[PDB]
């Protein structure tokens, strides 16, 4: 008698929570989709803003005979050029900190005496560079994956960005891309959120892996040039 009844009650309670949640969520999601759109638009506007800013500063400069040096890249990308075997243990660990644990692993890192110094040791095993926001986006759309309670999860919905980073104020892929490119208040978690990028074979051959990009080789910072490489791998 009583057991069955209490269950039926369970059921009603359930349909209830289901309706409440359905409408609440729906409302929330309207709000959301709107947010997303407003944000994306505004963001892109800000990019074009800065880029143009650079253009004109350059112009005033050129006219003066003076020159204008844009602020230096605060975000870099590194990809692992070399195999695992036969490496100094230090080097190994430096790689591990940069979270490139295998070949053709891209990742983002800040630009620091800290980070930059920690790359001295791996220079010959990796290429790093200064990516365009475009590149960054492309990476996150094609190669986007997320670290979810340890799982490696394809970036598809935004529900995920909200799940783990929501409270930081990251609701959307575009937001992600923004803290990345700006390197805002929470870079760190924005990053760790992003699974180390498993890339592809470059369509262009690498040039020479024994040689520094400077000698026509690949190892080092190709400052701006990293983008080309990414393009070849994507």
């Amino acid at each position: 008698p009583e057991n069955v009844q209490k269950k039926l009650a369970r059921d009603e309670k359930l349909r209830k929570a289901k309706a409440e949640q359905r409408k609440a969520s729906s409302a929330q999601m309207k709000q959301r989709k709107a947010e997303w759109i407003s944000k994306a638009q505004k963001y892109a506007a800000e990019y074009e803003a800065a880029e143009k800013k650079i253009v004109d500063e350059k112009r005033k400069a050129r006219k003066t005979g003076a020159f204008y040096v844009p602020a230096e890249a605060k975000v870099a990308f590194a990809i692992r050029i070399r195999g695992v075997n036969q490496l100094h243990p230090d080097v190994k660990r430096v790689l591990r900190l940069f979270r490139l644990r295998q070949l053709h692993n891209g990742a983002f890192f800040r630009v620091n005496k800290a980070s930059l110094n920690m790359i001295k040791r791996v220079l010959p095993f990796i290429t790093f560079g200064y990516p365009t926001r475009n590149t960054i986006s492309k990476l996150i759309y094609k190669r986007g994956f997320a670290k979810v309670n340890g799982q490696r999860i394809p970036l598809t919905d935004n529900t995920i960005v909200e799940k783990s980073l929501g409270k930081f104020g990251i609701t959307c892929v575009e937001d992600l891309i923004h803290e990345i490119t700006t390197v805002g208040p929470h870079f760190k978690e924005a990053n760790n959120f992003l699974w180390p990028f498993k890339l592809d074979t470059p369509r262009g051959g690498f040039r020479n892996k024994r040689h520094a990009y400077h000698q026509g080789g690949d190892w080092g910072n190709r400052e701006v040039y990293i983008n080309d490489l990414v393009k070849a791998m994507l």
Partner: protein, 180 residues
């Protein structure tokens, strides 16, 4: 090829021993607390599960004197649960009123706790009483054994107070000046 430790297959030692006992009843009690553990967010039950999956030797004795000694004003009204066997301490003179829950009561511990106006409880009962573990007191007995003295540091390294394995204790046994 990736350079991950143990190849990401690292074994988790953080977990609850899968018990091999054969009393059908332990397995069952365990079914119960697996339920309570996954479906109840109460630490107390999870705890009970970890400790009931214990190595036969890893279950440690609760004595009436042990319980008595650990009692607060609130500890008295509260259900006392040990994850182990509860036994009588023959040198406890007066025995308080207790409602105790263990796996096993030495019949002496039982007689004295009951004849003192007490109640003996088994975990199926405990479940029914307070699944959250509300107003429950979980007793973890002290850990002693002879093995422990042979362990630690080796027997005759500088500052070793550990005990040697000896077949007899006599003036003639490892009690004589070593070769120094």
């Amino acid at each position: 090829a990736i350079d991950l430790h143990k190849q990401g297959r690292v074994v988790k030692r953080s977990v609850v021993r899968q018990t091999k006992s054969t009393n059908v009843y332990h397995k069952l009690l365990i079914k119960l607390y697996k339920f309570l553990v996954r479906r109840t967010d109460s630490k107390f039950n999870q705890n009970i599960l970890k400790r009931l999956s214990s190595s036969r030797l890893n279950k440690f004795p609760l004595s009436l004197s042990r319980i008595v000694k650990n009692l607060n004003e609130t500890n008295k009204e509260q259900v006392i649960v040990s994850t182990s066997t509860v036994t009588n301490d023959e040198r406890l003179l007066t025995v308080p009123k207790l409602t105790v829950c263990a796996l096993k009561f030495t019949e002496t511990a039982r007689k004295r706790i009951l004849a003192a106006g007490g109640k003996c409880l088994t975990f199926d009962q405990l479940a029914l009483k307070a699944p959250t573990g509300t107003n429950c007191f979980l007793l973890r007995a002290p850990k002693s054994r002879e093995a422990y003295r042979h362990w630690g540091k080796a027997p005759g390294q500088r500052g070793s107070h550990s005990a040697p394995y000896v077949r007899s204790e006599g003036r003639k046994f490892e009690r004589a000046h070593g070769l120094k």
